[PDB]
Amino acid sequence: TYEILGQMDETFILVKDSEYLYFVDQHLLEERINYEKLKDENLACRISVKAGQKLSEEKIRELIKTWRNLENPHVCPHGRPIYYKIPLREIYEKVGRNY
Amino acid sequence: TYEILGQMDETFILVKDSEYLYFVDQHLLEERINYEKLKDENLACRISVKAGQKLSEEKIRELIKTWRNLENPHVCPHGRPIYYKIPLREIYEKVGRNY
Numbered sequence A, B: 001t002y003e004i005l006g007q008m009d010e011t012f013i014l015v016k017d018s019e020y021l022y023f024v025d026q027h028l029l030e031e032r033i034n035y036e037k038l039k040d041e042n043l044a045c046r047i048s049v050k051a052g053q054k055l056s057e058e059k060i061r062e063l064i065k066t067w068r069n070l071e072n073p074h075v076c077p078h079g080r081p082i083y084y085k086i087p088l089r090e091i092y093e094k095v096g097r098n099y
């Protein structure tokens, strides 16, 4: 139901479905995953993590599959959006194509 | 000065620099390249090309290098934008990060 486009700035993973392009914050995603494993209300939010990390394609595949099966895939436990999404339609329109 | 993120929908190539993320229309790009080779005022605009084409990573590298060295990299000969660009800052802001 989705396609992984790859990593950007060692900070975001780009994934798309039939409607949207998602920029998935890999730090906020790992934060949510570890929270669902271990619901620790008191862990520091990873919005402060600045250094990038190059991920293997296998690790990206595992992270994005986990994300797609998450019960709360939209926001970290602190309420920061895990991703920013863009309608594919917008991208097509900007070069003159209908989607 | 740029980084190739990869192909989307067999229609766009994603490339970024230090400021922007570019969605490069591969058909309009090839149109501009063939125009600079062969300045034919009367060739049909490729805005109508609908079918996708999976490109090799080598071919994508050659296309994007050519694009980056183009004298007119912004628009096809008919005036359709070859790319849509997004400030990286916007993407970072949407998850709560400053860029």
Ligand SMILES: [Mg+2]
Binding pocket: A071, A072, A073, A074, A075
């Ligand atoms: Mg959620």
Ligand SMILES: [Mg+2]
Binding pocket: A071, A072, A073, A074
């Ligand atoms: Mg939810």
Ligand SMILES: [Mg+2]
Binding pocket: B071, B072, B073, B074, B075
């Ligand atoms: Mg131009």
Ligand SMILES: [Mg+2]
Binding pocket: B071, B072, B073, B074
């Ligand atoms: Mg010009």
Ligand SMILES: [Zn+2]
Binding pocket: A031, A044, A045, A046, A047, A076, A077, A078, A079, A080
């Ligand atoms: Zn958080």
Ligand SMILES: [Zn+2]
Binding pocket: B031, B044, B045, B046, B047, B076, B077, B078, B079, B080
């Ligand atoms: Zn044209």
